[PDB]
Design a protein around this motif. Structure first.
Motif, mmCIF file in Angstrom:
data_model
loop_
_atom_site.group_PDB
_atom_site.id
_atom_site.type_symbol
_atom_site.label_atom_id
_atom_site.label_comp_id
_atom_site.label_asym_id
_atom_site.label_seq_id
_atom_site.Cartn_x
_atom_site.Cartn_y
_atom_site.Cartn_z
ATOM 1 N N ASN A 202 0.823 -1.204 0.000
ATOM 2 C CA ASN A 202 0.000 0.000 0.000
ATOM 3 C C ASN A 202 0.861 1.260 0.000
ATOM 4 O O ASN A 202 0.531 2.247 -0.668
ATOM 5 N N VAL A 203 1.980 1.240 0.729
ATOM 6 C CA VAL A 203 2.882 2.391 0.754
ATOM 7 C C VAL A 203 3.409 2.695 -0.645
ATOM 8 O O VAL A 203 3.495 3.860 -1.053
ATOM 9 N N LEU A 204 3.774 1.657 -1.400
ATOM 10 C CA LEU A 204 4.314 1.875 -2.739
ATOM 11 C C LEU A 204 3.261 2.455 -3.676
ATOM 12 O O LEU A 204 3.577 3.294 -4.530
ATOM 13 N N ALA A 205 2.005 2.019 -3.537
ATOM 14 C CA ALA A 205 0.927 2.615 -4.321
ATOM 15 C C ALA A 205 0.692 4.068 -3.931
ATOM 16 O O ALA A 205 0.328 4.891 -4.782
ATOM 17 N N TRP A 206 0.879 4.397 -2.653
ATOM 18 C CA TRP A 206 0.736 5.780 -2.215
ATOM 19 C C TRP A 206 1.798 6.671 -2.850
ATOM 20 O O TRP A 206 1.512 7.812 -3.229
ATOM 21 N N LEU A 207 3.025 6.161 -2.986
ATOM 22 C CA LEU A 207 4.077 6.924 -3.652
ATOM 23 C C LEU A 207 3.724 7.198 -5.108
ATOM 24 O O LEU A 207 3.988 8.292 -5.622
ATOM 25 N N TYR A 208 3.135 6.211 -5.793
ATOM 26 C CA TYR A 208 2.736 6.404 -7.184
ATOM 27 C C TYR A 208 1.684 7.496 -7.306
ATOM 28 O O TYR A 208 1.733 8.311 -8.234
ATOM 29 N N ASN A 213 0.362 13.028 -8.622
ATOM 30 C CA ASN A 213 -0.074 14.314 -8.097
ATOM 31 C C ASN A 213 1.073 15.277 -7.816
ATOM 32 O O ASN A 213 0.827 16.380 -7.321
ATOM 33 N N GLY A 214 2.309 14.897 -8.120
ATOM 34 C CA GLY A 214 3.369 15.884 -8.181
ATOM 35 C C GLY A 214 4.552 15.722 -7.250
ATOM 36 O O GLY A 214 5.692 15.962 -7.663
ATOM 37 N N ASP A 215 4.309 15.326 -6.003
ATOM 38 C CA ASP A 215 5.382 15.196 -5.022
ATOM 39 C C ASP A 215 6.325 14.088 -5.469
ATOM 40 O O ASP A 215 5.947 12.914 -5.464
ATOM 41 N N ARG A 216 7.534 14.456 -5.919
ATOM 42 C CA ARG A 216 8.437 13.461 -6.484
ATOM 43 C C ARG A 216 9.910 13.696 -6.157
ATOM 44 O O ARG A 216 10.781 13.129 -6.832
ATOM 45 N N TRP A 217 10.221 14.509 -5.150
ATOM 46 C CA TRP A 217 11.616 14.723 -4.786
ATOM 47 C C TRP A 217 12.292 13.431 -4.345
ATOM 48 O O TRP A 217 13.526 13.365 -4.321
ATOM 49 N N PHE A 218 11.511 12.407 -3.995
ATOM 50 C CA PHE A 218 12.045 11.144 -3.507
ATOM 51 C C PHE A 218 12.504 10.209 -4.619
ATOM 52 O O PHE A 218 13.072 9.154 -4.315
ATOM 53 N N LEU A 219 12.263 10.550 -5.886
ATOM 54 C CA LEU A 219 12.755 9.724 -6.982
ATOM 55 C C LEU A 219 14.274 9.702 -6.932
ATOM 56 O O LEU A 219 14.929 10.706 -7.232
ATOM 57 N N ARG A 221 18.449 8.087 -7.013
ATOM 58 C CA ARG A 221 19.414 7.789 -8.062
ATOM 59 C C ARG A 221 19.802 6.320 -8.121
ATOM 60 O O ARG A 221 20.276 5.863 -9.167
ATOM 61 N N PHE A 222 19.603 5.574 -7.039
ATOM 62 C CA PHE A 222 20.023 4.184 -6.979
ATOM 63 C C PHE A 222 18.939 3.250 -7.514
ATOM 64 O O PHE A 222 17.799 3.647 -7.769
ATOM 65 N N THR A 223 19.319 1.990 -7.686
ATOM 66 C CA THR A 223 18.417 0.887 -7.979
ATOM 67 C C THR A 223 18.580 -0.180 -6.901
ATOM 68 O O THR A 223 19.382 -0.033 -5.971
ATOM 69 N N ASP A 262 12.327 0.256 -9.255
ATOM 70 C CA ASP A 262 12.928 1.580 -9.103
ATOM 71 C C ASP A 262 12.243 2.379 -7.999
ATOM 72 O O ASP A 262 12.896 3.145 -7.281
ATOM 73 N N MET A 263 10.924 2.232 -7.859
ATOM 74 C CA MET A 263 10.231 2.902 -6.765
ATOM 75 C C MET A 263 10.634 2.306 -5.422
ATOM 76 O O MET A 263 10.753 3.027 -4.426
ATOM 77 N N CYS A 264 10.855 0.990 -5.382
ATOM 78 C CA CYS A 264 11.310 0.347 -4.153
ATOM 79 C C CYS A 264 12.649 0.913 -3.697
ATOM 80 O O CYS A 264 12.885 1.080 -2.494
ATOM 81 N N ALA A 265 13.541 1.210 -4.647
ATOM 82 C CA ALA A 265 14.835 1.791 -4.299
ATOM 83 C C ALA A 265 14.671 3.162 -3.657
ATOM 84 O O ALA A 265 15.425 3.527 -2.748
ATOM 85 N N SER A 266 13.701 3.947 -4.131
ATOM 86 C CA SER A 266 13.413 5.225 -3.492
ATOM 87 C C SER A 266 12.904 5.025 -2.068
ATOM 88 O O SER A 266 13.302 5.750 -1.148
ATOM 89 N N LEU A 267 12.023 4.043 -1.868
ATOM 90 C CA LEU A 267 11.517 3.768 -0.528
ATOM 91 C C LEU A 267 12.631 3.290 0.392
ATOM 92 O O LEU A 267 12.682 3.671 1.569
ATOM 93 N N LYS A 268 13.540 2.462 -0.134
ATOM 94 C CA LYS A 268 14.648 1.948 0.667
ATOM 95 C C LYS A 268 15.471 3.082 1.265
ATOM 96 O O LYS A 268 15.806 3.058 2.456
ATOM 97 N N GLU A 269 15.795 4.096 0.458
ATOM 98 C CA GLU A 269 16.517 5.244 0.994
ATOM 99 C C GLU A 269 15.619 6.108 1.866
ATOM 100 O O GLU A 269 16.102 6.752 2.805
ATOM 101 N N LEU A 270 14.316 6.137 1.577
ATOM 102 C CA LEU A 270 13.391 6.840 2.458
ATOM 103 C C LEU A 270 13.412 6.235 3.855
ATOM 104 O O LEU A 270 13.507 6.953 4.856
#
Lengths: 305, 305
Positions: A202-208, A213-219, A221-223, A262-270
């Motif tokens: 559910n968290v990953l769907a929330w990021l999508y 809707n615009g908030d994307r500073w969390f994209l 650089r890593f994989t 790729d979204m999981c990698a953003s969450l990992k650093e989050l």
């Protein structure tokens, strides 16, 4: 545009709530055709909830001791039965407001709407998700027992009936067959709930939704890979992420151009480095009560009967 | 126990939504007795919204060009009028589902429920507060215009009709008389919204709910006066706090034993020194969309017809 936590329209459900009385206790009920469903502990007074034998107590009760008040009009109980933890109070007049309903047992990680009621009358509606430990975190007062959780498909799907509030403040209940979610029992004793883990999918769907809707500073650089992600998540107490979860994330991946891994990698650093006092969709925390299906329903605006 | 953001039961409202078509654009409408209310920009195509003269365009429209579809059954427009920014589409058959309704213009800082709809059908309901700058932060897609905001008293109080989405993503609309909240106009040009300040009085009521529900580590050691508080708030962009706000906080002060000015002192240190990664009622931010009246309704469980 925008993103809110939307509950389902409550009109169909709020035509089915009845007031059920047996002794001094007054809780709510679900009026389907000619069977009234309500928690079986209504036959129980305050001293009874401690160590109650339910099979014996109904024997000491008869058809004339339950009062099913539908607003002004009162119904006459004509037959009673116990289905696990529920009373089927058969009555005479079949409800004209019965919708296309269904009986479903949800799985952990899924979301539904709750129509909190008191004395058979609707007081509010809100959206909640079943925790992995089979509890919920709602707003239930005394007398709100019998309040139902539903999903609207042109069909209503009742999946939850609130029974008790744990001494930790969290809430527990059953389905419309009377079977509890989790190891809980309807007696007033210390019952233990387990480790509550964050719903990763559910968290990953929330990021999508945030990227839509615009908030994307969390994209980032890593994989990362899918074992590498689950190793980090189990340390931050997040449930392991499966391939079927990725398949469920397919339409969101297609619409946004961001691969699931790729979204999981953003969450990992989050998780490892926090959100740093910076918000996503107006929140400073990671939200786990939007299922992937939910994000599609709101960003594409499907409606119902 | 517990605390959630509850919306009002949507059954009464969702029986009043109609589908209104005029040309290619399809938006929603509010069916009250024999007058259908919907935004006046329905008569407007995509090119029209730029620099439209509304008085002239209706003249080029006749009674047979608006289609008011109520689900299956279709109505026949019999008379039309423009009330500021709204079309009163008088029809022949008076709606049997008309409730006890009211027309109210809310003030900034107050909260209501929104039934987001598309093509005249309900899709979700959620709770929102009017910002001080007379905008809202909801979830509106294309075709959701005409969705109404209401409060249920045994009376419904409609107070908002969504019209446009600002290029900043925030939403603007009018009341059921057709008068906009704020300086906005229904044309597609850059319209400026002002400084959005946090609603202080709602935040203080949210803290009281937290004390009722347990989260109380913020109960501080210092005190303060009412000029001293407002000086700190204006720097953190919080609206000044009045004596009438204190009188509104009376019942919460009585129930909890915490004086209104003593709670303000806790907030003052909260603003100056943050929340430190620690949550209140499950949030890492200060919530300003629970009015003091709202906290009483949920913690005491009043119901409605």
């Amino acid at each position: 545009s925008g993103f809110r936590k939307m509950a389902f329209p409550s009109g169909k459900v709020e035509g089915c709530m009845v007031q059920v009385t047996c002794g001094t206790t007054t809780l709510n009920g679900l009026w389907l055709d000619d069977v009234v469903y309500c928690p079986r502990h209504v036959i129980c007074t305050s001293e009874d909830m401690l160590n109650p034998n339910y099979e014996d107590l109904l024997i000491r009760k008869s058809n004339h001791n339950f009062l099913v008040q539908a607003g002004n009009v009162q119904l006459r109980v004509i037959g009673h039965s116990m289905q696990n933890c529920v009373l089927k109070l058969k009555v005479d007049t079949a409800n004209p407001k019965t919708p296309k309903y269904k009986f479903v047992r949800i799985q952990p990680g899924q979301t539904f709407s709750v129509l909190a009621c008191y004395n058979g009358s609707p007081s509010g509606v809100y959206q909640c998700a079943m925790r992995p430990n089979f509890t919920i975190k709602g707003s239930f007062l005394n007398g709100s027992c019998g309040s139902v959780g539903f999903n609207i498909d042109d069909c209503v799907s009742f999946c939850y009936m609130h029974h008790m509030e744990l001494p930790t403040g969290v809430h527990a209940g059953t389905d419309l067959e009377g079977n509890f979610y989790g190891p809980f029992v309807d007696r007033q004793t210390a019952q233990a709930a387990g480790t509550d883990t964050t719903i990763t999918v559910n968290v990953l769907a929330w990021l999508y939704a945030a990227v839509i809707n615009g908030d994307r500073w969390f994209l980032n650089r890593f994989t990362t890979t899918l074992n590498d992600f689950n190793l980090v998540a189990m340390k931050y107490n997040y449930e392991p992420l499966t391939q079927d979860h990725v398949d469920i994330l397919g339409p969101l991946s297609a619409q946004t151009g961001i691969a699931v891994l790729d979204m999981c990698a953003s969450l990992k650093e989050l998780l490892q480095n926090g959100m740093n006092g910076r918000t996503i969709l107006g929140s400073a925390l990671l939200e786990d009560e939007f299922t992937p299906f939910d994000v599609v329903r709101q960003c594409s605006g499907v409606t119902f009967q």
